[PDB]
Design a protein around this ligand. Structure first.
Ligand SMILES: NC(=O)c1ccc[n+]([C@@H]2O[C@H](COP(=O)([O-])OP(=O)(O)OC[C@H]3O[C@@H](n4cnc5c(N)ncnc54)[C@H](OP(=O)(O)O)[C@@H]3O)[C@@H](O)[C@H]2O)c1
Ligand SMILES: Nc1nc(=O)c2nc(CNc3ccc(C(=O)N[C@@H](CCC(=O)O)C(=O)O)cc3)cnc2[nH]1
Ligand SMILES: [Mn+2]
Ligand SMILES: [Mn+2]
Ligand SMILES: [Mn+2]
Length: 159
């Protein structure tokens, strides 16, 4: 099974200038819980944005060029990325925009955080078709001293 996980600001913005400009510790904790002990697939730009391997997960990087770091696994196509995960119950695709576009048609589950924040961005989550997806979990949180925007954790499953 393939799942996508992402955090979206208003208008599906996910990034600006190869960064995420907000800081929501509760959402990063949610990301860790839902990805730990699973393989994670990311594009090269997202690898550069994170800047280091994510511990406790097999890190798989898509790039058309040879890898530059043997602490992670480098692959050159979607099918190779999937194969490199092995026989696991759930593969997590962690972006960015280009990678999400390619894996969305193959995904059964979306883990989406909707953040109430207006962000100028240059990267968006794909325009997916709402009719294709059932919401099976949602949990709203108001802003607090640690998290400066309200946010909504949602899990959707392909109908
Ligand atoms: N809010 C969130 O949830 C979230 C999550 C992830 C990322 N982001 C943000 O998203 C932005 C990065 O997204 P992005 O769309 O620019 O880039 P991306 O999807 O992270 O990386 C694209 C790169 O991945 C490689 N690639 C993708 N598909 C491939 C394929 N089929 N075969 C081979 N290589 C492939 C290519 O690398 P080469 O050029 O080396 O061939 C391509 O240039 C950043 O702003 C980041 O902060 C946000
Ligand atoms: N919901 C969601 N939020 C995100 O921030 C997110 N980020 C990415 C890509 N970028 C990043 C950037 C940093 C870390 C990170 O530092 N993660 C630590 C945090 C642990 C914690 O704060 O509790 C990790 O071990 O996962 C992960 C992904 C992909 N999907 C996402 N999905
Ligand atoms: Mn091929
Ligand atoms: Mn197999
Ligand atoms: Mn806000």
């Amino acid at each position: 099974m393939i799942s996508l996980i992402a955090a979206l600001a208003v208008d599906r913005v996910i990034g600006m200038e190869n960064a995420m400009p907000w800081n929501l510790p509760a959402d990063l904790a949610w990301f860790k819980r839902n990805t730990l002990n699973k393989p994670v697939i990311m594009g090269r730009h997202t690898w550069e944005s994170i800047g280091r391997p994510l511990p406790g997960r097999k890190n798989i990087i898509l790039s058309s060029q040879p890898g530059t770091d043997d602490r992670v696994t480098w692959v050159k196509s979607v099918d190779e990325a999937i194969a490199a995960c092995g026989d696991v119950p759930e593969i997590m695709v962690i972006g960015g925009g280009r990678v999400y576009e390619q894996f969305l048609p193959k995904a059964q589950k979306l883990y989406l955080t909707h953040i109430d924040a207006e962000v100028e961005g240059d990267t968006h989550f794909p325009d997916y078709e709402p009719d294709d997806w059932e919401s099976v979990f949602s949990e709203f949180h108001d802003a607090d001293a640690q998290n400066s925007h309200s946010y909504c954790f949602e899990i959707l499953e392909r109908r």
